[PDB]
Structure 1
């Protein structure tokens, strides 16, 4: 079965995952900020 959300948050800290950050970087749209 898939892990729970709190497990996913816990997994991110231990394994130092940066994919979630990288997705935000790709979604970064300069127009939205300005």
Structure 2
């Protein structure tokens, strides 16, 4: 059984994850 989204939103919050945050850093260079 795979994890859903709204429980995985609870995952990155409760486990103290920054992997969602760290990927948003390397995604952008000159978005303007």
TM norm structure 1: 0.72
Q: Could you list the runs of 5+ residues in structure 2 that have no partner in the other structure?
A: none
Which structure 1 residue ranges, 4+ long, deviate > 2 Å from structure 2?
Answer: none
Is the helix fraction higher in 1 or 2? 1
Q: Which has the higher relative contact order, 1 or 2, with Cα contacts under 8 A spaced 6 or more apart?
A: 2
RMSD, aligned α-carbons: 1.2
Instruction: Give the total of aligned pairs.
Output: 32
Task: Tell me which structure has the larger Cα radius of gyration.
Answer: 1
TM norm structure 2: 0.74
